Subunit: 116 residues, 2 copies
Amino acid sequence: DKVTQSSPDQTVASGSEVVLLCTYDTVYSNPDLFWYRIRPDYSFQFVFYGDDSRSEGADFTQGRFSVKHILTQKAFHLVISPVRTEDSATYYCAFTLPPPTDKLIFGKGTRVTVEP
Amino acid sequence: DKVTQSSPDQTVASGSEVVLLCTYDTVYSNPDLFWYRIRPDYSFQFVFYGDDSRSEGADFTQGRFSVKHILTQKAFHLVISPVRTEDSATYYCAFTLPPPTDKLIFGKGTRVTVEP
């Protein structure tokens, strides 16, 4: 069970559009998928959730964030359009193991630096 | 590089003392260490931070939480005393890979359910 984040770290100007890649490899079907981000001040923020039939963004993502969950590719890509300075962080894609365990398996992270 | 969380998942009574064990396996000099916790609603909370000479906890930790950082044993144990129902969550220990990487390696997670 592991997550792959193939996107190189990126530095972009505010107002750009960015895509963070993620693919999951797990023996369990329909895992709960997530996107979290570590901000410079250490806060770990919930960004997006999704399973095979639905996705849900955090309150603050309305209209600028969306995920591309492609089943045949086992992909759970995050798209930010447009990105803002406050989006500077390291994004972690992850999935949980089935209950009662339901513990998280994290990807290695992808840093996005947004120049003001 | 690995993070080992040795405490068993546990359910305990409000008012009890809980010890969350964490040992890190890395060759990097003075890595940043962390304790994070995730609540049922998917929200993650920064709990404690520390390097080889200091430690700083979240604002809510003053008075009830503390970390035991044993350099010789690469140990970063979290102690909650006393625990309250609000502390129910799964705790994750992690350390930072040095620059330019600056990404986290997580432990498996330890569930602590506190019953009133």
